[PDB]
Amino acid sequence: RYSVVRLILGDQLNHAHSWFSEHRDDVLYLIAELHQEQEYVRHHIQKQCAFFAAMQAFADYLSAEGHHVWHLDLDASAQYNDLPDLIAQICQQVQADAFQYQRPDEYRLLEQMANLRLSGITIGCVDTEHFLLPFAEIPEQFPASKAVLMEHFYRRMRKRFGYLMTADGKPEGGQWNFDADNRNKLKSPDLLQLPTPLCFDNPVASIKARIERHRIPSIGQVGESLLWPINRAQALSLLAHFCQICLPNFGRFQDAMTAQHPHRWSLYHSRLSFALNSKLLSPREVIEATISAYRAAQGQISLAQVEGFVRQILGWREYVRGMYWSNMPHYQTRNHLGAQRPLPSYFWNGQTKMRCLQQAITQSLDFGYAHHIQRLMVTGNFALLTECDPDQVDAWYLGIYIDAIEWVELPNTRGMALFADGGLIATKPYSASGSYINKMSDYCASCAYQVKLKSGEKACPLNSLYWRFMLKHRDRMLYKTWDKMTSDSQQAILSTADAYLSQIESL
Ligand SMILES: Cc1cc2nc3c(=O)[nH]c(=O)nc-3n(C[C@H](O)[C@H](O)[C@H](O)COP(=O)(O)OP(=O)(O)OC[C@H]3O[C@@H](n4cnc5c(N)ncnc54)[C@H](O)[C@@H]3O)c2cc1C
Ligand SMILES: Cc1nc2c(=O)[nH]c(=O)nc-2n(C[C@H](O)[C@H](O)[C@H](O)CO)c1C
Ligand code: SF4
């Protein structure tokens, strides 16, 4: 039937992979929805729908290109016990002589494929041909258990790939990082000017029925249509919409949050993370499209916006991938601060009196997405200050977000947010009181708590929790604000924090 069998996973939808540059009738391509891939974490139903639709679209595109593709849905993959069983049975059925696959982007899948063994079949693993940094270079660029600085890696990447560089090898604009100009709050004139996010109309009724018929666990909600891009064409449309609509304001409101506007869930962000992680788009092409848009705008897009966007993909994404692949098997076990508190229940329903937490959790449950500052300084900050269990936080983050693959979820969550790796990524806890939220958002205007109150009834819980965290880990000018208080005020704040922790289920 077939001599070579190649496997395509759900996040390896690269239309430009070297595999498909060759048109061969002795090669059979395999894409399959997998119970085991739905069982290692409780995915968002939006994420499951998006991945299934994207896999079907990729299979259809490859078949239209002439390649032999066998797409197996849950109704056809249930007969096999797991992915190795599926691979072995299909290879034996087609009498294949060789099996090949692209290197997975999670440690569990990578180890599973590495330990896969087939009788009389040569096993091969090839690069996904997606990431800017080659996989083999990770050991040198990221020593194990080494607190690699993201700024130096980002500068090296900028020099290596020639992005935002002068003719004499210097950063464009006179400085490497423009984040200081990218910390503005959304005001009423800005809120009125918020653009309509680009949404797609992808029916998901059949996919949802298939998921429910197989009793696949899931979280979140979907209607009859999915707004997320499910193919390369829709991903390119989203990229163009970002470039011509949101890019002139992406940096300016990178850290902004709001509870007023109906489009508060998107703001000026790209929302291209799923397309990049599913590999429908490449980081190189996204970066170059944004740079070309910035150069064409003739000043309408300032250097800070394009630099802040290019940092997130060139430096942060590649750096997180490198740190993950250099430290993973032991990185998963790191609990530096000894956090063991169970995750509060409202993380699954959004029923909390804290406005920031309610907005972030409800947005994640309804859209399967939250922009970066939410994940870092609302949910991440709450989990860090409340000493929530890193395992449960990782499960929530890896499941509820459509763009969540462990290679990027684990460092950002365990290290950057929870400081559970000792600072190998963040180098400092991203701990904040309610003052940061009040400065960057309008949540405190709609909150039942008072952000100007630090202790007592109706005070913002973050104010007491942050100070309790800082005093608990004081041995590492911040504490000046603590040393400038009366002892009675300090004890009132600490007792308020303890009471809030005791009633954490009623916040
Ligand atoms: C606790 C925590 C968990 C996170 N988990 C994930 C995750 O599972 N998957 C994921 O893709 N991102 C994750 N991030 C990074 C960031 O939240 C998302 O990349 C972003 O919110 C996706 O929305 P966007 O495409 O509009 O991003 P934009 O604001 O439009 O940023 C542009 C692009 O930059 C990249 N990027 C930005 N920040 C990061 C980052 N910290 N690490 C890697 N790439 C980055 C993404 O590809 C993103 O599409 C996490 C961040 C935190 C603080
Ligand atoms: C929800 C989901 N479903 C599937 C699936 O049905 N089949 C598949 O091959 N992959 C799926 N994935 C992606 C993987 O679970 C995983 O995150 C990546 O393959 C890691 O590279 C995900 C995330
Ligand atoms: S007052 Fe405190 S709890 Fe309420 S929205 Fe502001 S930071 Fe969040």
Numbering used by the authors: 2 to 477, 486 to 516
Report text from the authors:
We determined the crystal structure of Vc (6-4) PL at 2.5 Å resolution at cryogenic temperature at the Turkish Light Source known as “Turkish DeLight”. The structure contains all the cofactors with well-defined electron densities and contains a total of 24 α helixes and five β sheets. It consists of two domains: an α-helical domain that is associated with FAD and α/β domain which interacts with DMRL cofactor. We identified a critical water molecule (W22) that interacts with Asp12, Gln13, Asp106, and DMRL in Vc (6-4) PL. However, the W22 molecule interacts with Asp106 of the Vc (6-4) PL with a distance of 2.8 Å, while the same interaction occurs with Gly105 of other bacterial (6-4) PLs with a distance of over 3.3 Å. Unlike At (6-4) PL or Rs (6-4) PL, Vc (6-4) PL Glu410 amino acid faces away from FAD and interacts with Asp395 rather than a His365 residue. Cys357, Cys445, Cys448, and Cys461 sulfide atoms make bonds with Fe atoms in the cluster with each bond at 2.3 Å distance. The function of the [4Fe-4S] cluster is currently unknown; however, its distance to the FAD is 17 Å, which indicates it does not have a catalytic role in the DNA repair due to its large distance to the active site region. Notably, we have not observed a distinct electron density of amino acid residues between 478 and 485 Vc (6-4) PL. Due to the position of the 23rd helix, DNA lesions cannot bind the Vc (6-4) PL similar to Dm (6-4) PL.
Photolyases (PLs) reverse UV-induced DNA damage using blue light as an energy source. Of these PLs, (6-4) PLs repair (6-4)-lesioned photoproducts. However, studies with different bacteria revealed the presence of (6–4) PLs. These bacterial (6–4) PLs are distinct in that they contain [4 Fe-4 S] as well as DMRL and FAD cofactors.
